[PDB]
Design a protein around this ligand. Structure first.
Ligand SMILES: *[C@@H]1O[C@H](CO)[C@@H](O[C@@H]2O[C@H](CO)[C@@H](O)[C@H](O)[C@H]2NC(C)=O)[C@H](O)[C@H]1NC(C)=O
Ligand SMILES: *[C@@H]1O[C@H](CO)[C@@H](O[C@@H]2O[C@H](CO)[C@@H](O)[C@H](O)[C@H]2NC(C)=O)[C@H](O)[C@H]1NC(C)=O
Ligand SMILES: *[C@@H]1O[C@H](CO)[C@@H](O[C@@H]2O[C@H](CO)[C@@H](O)[C@H](O)[C@H]2NC(C)=O)[C@H](O)[C@H]1NC(C)=O
Ligand SMILES: *[C@@H]1O[C@H](CO)[C@@H](O[C@@H]2O[C@H](CO)[C@@H](O)[C@H](O)[C@H]2NC(C)=O)[C@H](O)[C@H]1NC(C)=O
Ligand SMILES: *[C@@H]1O[C@H](CO)[C@@H](O[C@@H]2O[C@H](CO)[C@@H](O)[C@H](O)[C@H]2NC(C)=O)[C@H](O)[C@H]1NC(C)=O
Ligand SMILES: *[C@@H]1O[C@H](CO)[C@@H](O[C@@H]2O[C@H](CO)[C@@H](O)[C@H](O)[C@H]2NC(C)=O)[C@H](O)[C@H]1NC(C)=O
Ligand code: NAG
Ligand code: NAG
Ligand code: NAG
Ligand code: NAG
Ligand code: NAG
Ligand code: NAG
Lengths: 50, 203, 86, 418
């Protein structure tokens, strides 16, 4: 499952069978690291008007 | 930037018009924005696809223009409604509405014509050069409580006077500019003074 | 700032009447450089309130306020057929 | 069932009978108005194309559509600060109440800022405040809640210590119960009524205003009017975002899957298909946001005039500053809006009296100077019409016009000559 952004440690807890999570608008919010199983949050890369 | 408010209306409409026209140069996926080049360059059975493509694009941009023009028209109508009521109440009368006909106590207004709008010159009365005075809600006089008929009771430090509250103009307190209601044992902060009786000098 | 990262303006501890608004309580203005500050909402004032004291104006002034309102706009119209198809 | 329109009632109308209130009550009405809405904006290019370069370049074939959309949202965002400023910034200076809050028995601690709290909001404002990413962004307001609270505080301090003079001119101090006396005369009730009932009035006021804090804690649907604004905008935003998952006839809603799965000369057809779909949904969002903005502006305009006429003055407009005879108002700040607490005088405990349009006296017709002529069954008195307070009929509270042969329903009495 693809995406782009900044990966940080998550404080969320996934159930043992869950691989990634989604927010209210059904957008990927977090993923599980498939090798060590830590949960990583995905934040957007900053952008905005200048 | 005094008349910017009317200029902003002109500018928004000028931009909407100019945008609508420049938008015709957009091709919306067609090989060319110009109908005359596709009809002469491309065989009819296919040119119709590009003509239809341009129509959808241009019809959409026109629909967008009209929609915004209707919304903008509503804003102007609301302003016109305000101007209409404001003229009736500020020019053809004297409103009592605070900050409606400008800041201060409204006296009168004089409208002036402007391109696509109206300008009101509001003439208002503004209090100034106030002084500190000591007050009382009532004057106690031989047991009766006297309240000001129209103004307020003030003291200059030695004598009590009655004044209109919007302009200092001291009058001796008399039975003609006060009225009696109840007595000295009821009013909180009542003070002792002498209320002049205009008839006493004769009787 | 809360609004975003402001580069080139300096931050001062003096509030001023606003000029060019940024957002989140911050405004900027030009002094001899561009500054950013928390905007002032009005002058500091207090009413000399007392249970037995009133202030009464003794002299009045008269002023004229100019209020501008739009009434109408240019009556622009376009026919759909010529606009689209020429 | 068939709904009832109101209780069954009848007025005891008679050609010679009037009812006059003998005791009044004071109540506080809470009126909530929205002033502003969240300054949501989205750029057309990132919303539609994300990080797909061929989409970003293809989108240029739509000309200015993106410019028009970006401009419309910018215009709304600016308007929202204008709406806030024109409602709350009604002052020239920030006024504060004195350290010694002696207002003649009137307790305003519920509406004045609470100095023990870091937010320095009033006990009532606390309830008003406590109860209420892919190309999109939300910009902060110019005036933060703290600054709105400061303007509100200035308005209360002004209203309490200088009445309406801080609005029309300089803030001139006046004893609180004395400005209340002015406010009573302003509704046709002579000021002596207040001074002989000052303790009663202060107690009715203190209770009526205290009840606001209690009512708002038990009524979830009290601030629904401001919540509805938040909900409509939240839904519009969430709908706009979920709509990106719609494919509009494309093989996939995701540009990154079609550009990598489908050869470019055909992928462009599906990219263009997605752009048309997404551009249309964005146009729909902006159009509704402009219409919604107009509704908020109209409310803000109402709030602005209402503050000037209800708070910085005493309107004479019926049911404008709440139901009853308006005395004064005290604004409170709320998220995205303003709440007005309207203090009104309400007639009560009326009694039936017999009336006359005039008194006949040695051939002359005497009309009441200011009040009405009433009879208690044996004697005629003259009273103010908004509060029973009988006076002997004298030549100083009546005037003569015409004679006893003209007025219909004229009665014979004695007019006292002082
Ligand atoms: C309050 O007003 C009274 C009346 O004007 C002042 O008393 C007068 O003072 C003038 C001198 O300036 C005398 O010529 C008058 O004869 C006084 N009139 C009376 C009735 O005494 C009084 O001084 C003022 N008090 C203050 C503190 O200014
Ligand atoms: C106003 O005048 C009355 C008298 O007409 C004063 O009444 C006195 O009140 C005190 C209590 O404070 C009593 O001990 C006296 O016996 C009362 N006098 C009389 C003649 O009954 C009243 O105090 C005066 N008020 C002011 C502010 O001076
Ligand atoms: C104004 O009203 C407030 C209540 O809203 C009063 O505060 C209370 O004072 C009593 C003591 O008499 C305390 O036991 C309560 O806990 C206080 N309540 C709150 C919310 O603080 C205040 O004293 C009144 N002030 C005046 C001048 O009447
Ligand atoms: C006018 O109405 C008020 C109530 O709004 C009356 O005051 C109450 O009187 C009762 C006793 O009958 C007390 O228990 C209440 O505590 C009083 N309430 C307040 C706020 O003071 C008042 O007596 C009535 N006056 C007249 C002339 O009828
Ligand atoms: C109408 O009002 C008058 C005046 O208050 C009442 O007459 C007084 O009645 C009291 C007894 O309650 C007597 O002590 C007074 O001397 C009477 N005054 C006069 C001038 O007669 C009268 O009773 C009231 N009428 C009705 C129907 O209530
Ligand atoms: C008020 O008083 C006048 C007298 O000043 C009354 O006038 C009488 O009217 C009747 C007709 O109804 C005549 O027949 C009498 O001759 C008139 N009297 C005089 C002295 O001229 C009048 O009726 C009285 N009105 C009421 C309601 O009592
Ligand atoms: C990844 O390899 C480590 C060995 O270093 C192993 O302990 C771990 O369980 C492996 N992770 C998964 C998901 O199999
Ligand atoms: C009234 O007196 C106070 C001092 O208590 C002073 O600050 C205020 O400026 C005075 N007001 C006028 C109008 O003189
Ligand atoms: C004002 O307050 C003082 C107490 O500081 C009191 O003695 C005085 O009588 C009060 N005056 C009025 C009109 O309430
Ligand atoms: C503002 O005041 C703080 C001390 O509270 C000081 O450390 C800071 O340098 C000052 N900033 C400016 C721009 O003067
Ligand atoms: C006045 O009298 C009528 C009877 O004709 C009665 O129905 C009404 O309630 C009375 N009104 C008052 C205020 O006493
Ligand atoms: C009221 O009507 C009656 C008839 O029922 C009449 O006798 C009386 O004079 C009238 N009173 C007034 C003030 O019109």
């Amino acid at each position: 499952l693809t995406g782009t952004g900044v990966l940080t440690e998550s404080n969320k807890k996934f159930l043992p069978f869950q691989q990634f999570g989604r927010d209210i608008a059904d957008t990927t919010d977090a993923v599980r690291d498939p090798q060590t199983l830590e949960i990583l949050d995905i934040t957007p890369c900053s952008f905005g008007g200048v | 930037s005094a008349l910017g408010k009317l200029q902003d209306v002109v500018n928004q409409n000028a931009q909407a018009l100019n945008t609508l026209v420049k938008q015709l140069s957009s091709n919306f996926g067609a090989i060319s924005s110009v109908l005359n080049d596709i009809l002469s360059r491309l065989d009819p059975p296919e040119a119709e696809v590009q003509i239809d493509r341009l129509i959808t694009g241009r019809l959409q941009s026109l629909q967008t223009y009209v929609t915004q023009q209707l919304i903008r028209a509503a804003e102007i109508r609301a302003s016109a409604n305000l101007a209409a009521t404001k003229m009736s109440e500020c020019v053809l009368g004297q409103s009592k509405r605070v900050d409606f006909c400008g800041k201060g106590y409204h006296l009168m207004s004089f409208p002036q014509s402007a391109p696509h709008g109206v300008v009101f010159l509001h003439v208002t009365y503004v209090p100034a050069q106030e002084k500190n005075f000591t007050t009382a809600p009532a004057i106690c006089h031989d047991g009766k409580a006297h309240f000001p008929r129209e103004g307020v009771f003030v003291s200059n430090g030695t004598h009590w006077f009655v004044t209109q509250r919007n302009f200092y103009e001291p009058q001796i307190i008399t039975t003609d500019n006060t009225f009696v209601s109840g007595n000295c044992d009821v009013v909180i902060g009542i003070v002792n003074n002498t209320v002049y009786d205009p008839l006493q000098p004769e009787l | 700032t809360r609004a975003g990262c402001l580069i080139g303006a300096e931050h001062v501890n003096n509030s001023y009447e606003c000029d060019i608004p940024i957002g989140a309580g911050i405004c900027a203005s030009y002094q001899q450089s561009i500054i950013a500050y928390t905007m002032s909402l009005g002058a500091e004032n207090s009413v000399a309130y007392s249970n037995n004291s009133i202030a009464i104006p003794t002299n009045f002034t008269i002023s004229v306020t100019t209020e501008i309102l739009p009434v109408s706009m240019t009556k622009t119209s376009v026919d759909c057929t010529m606009y689209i198809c020429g | 069932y068939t709904m009832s329109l109101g209780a069954e009632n009848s007025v005891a109308y008679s050609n010679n009978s009037i009812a006059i209130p003998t005791n009044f009550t004071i109540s506080v009405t809470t009126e909530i108005l929205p002033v502003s809405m969240t300054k949501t904006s989205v750029d057309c290019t990132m919303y539609i194309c994300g990080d797909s370069t061929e989409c970003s370049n293809l989108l240029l074939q739509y000309g200015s559509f993106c410019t028009q959309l970006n401009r419309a949202l910018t215009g709304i965002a600016v308007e929202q600060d204008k709406n806030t400023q024109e409602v709350f910034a009604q002052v020239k200076q920030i006024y504060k109440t004195p350290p010694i809050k002696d207002f003649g028995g009137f307790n305003f601690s519920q509406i004045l800022p609470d100095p023990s709290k870091p937010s320095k909001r009033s006990p009532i404002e606390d309830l008003l405040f406590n109860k209420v990413f892919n190309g999109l962004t939300v910009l902060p307001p110019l005036l933060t809640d703290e600054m709105i609270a400061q303007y509100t505080s200035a308005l209360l301090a002004g209203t309490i210590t200088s009445g309406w003079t801080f609005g029309a001119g300089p803030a001139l101090q006046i004893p609180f119960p004395m400005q209340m006396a002015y406010r009573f005369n302003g509704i046709g009730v002579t000021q002596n009524v207040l001074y002989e009932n000052q303790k009663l009035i202060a107690n009715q006021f203190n209770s009526a205003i205290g009840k606001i804090q209690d009512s708002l804690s038990s009524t979830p649907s009290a601030l629904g009017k401001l919540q509805d604004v938040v909900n409509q905008n939240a839904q519009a935003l969430n709908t706009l975002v979920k709509q990106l998952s719609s494919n509009f006839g494309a093989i996939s809603s995701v540009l990154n899957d079609i550009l990598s799965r489908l050869d470019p000369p055909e992928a462009e057809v599906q990219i263009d298909r997605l752009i048309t779909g997404r551009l249309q949904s964005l146009q729909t969002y902006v159009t509704q946001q402009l219409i919604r903005a107009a509704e908020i502006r109209a409310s803000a305009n109402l709030a602005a005039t209402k503050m000037s006429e209800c708070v910085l003055g005493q309107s004479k407009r019926v049911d404008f500053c709440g139901k009853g005879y308006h005395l004064m108002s005290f604004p409170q700040s709320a998220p995205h809006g303003v709440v007005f607490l309207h203090v009104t005088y309400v007639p009560a405990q009326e009694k039936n009296f017999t009336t006359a349009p005039a008194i006949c006296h040695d051939g002359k017709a005497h009309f009441p100077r200011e009040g009405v002529f009433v009879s208690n069954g044996t004697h005629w008195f003259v009273t103010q019409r908004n509060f029973y307070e009988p006076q002997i009929i004298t030549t100083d509270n009546t005037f003569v016009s015409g004679n006893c042969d003209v007025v219909i329903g004229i009665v014979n009495n004695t007019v006292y000559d002082p």
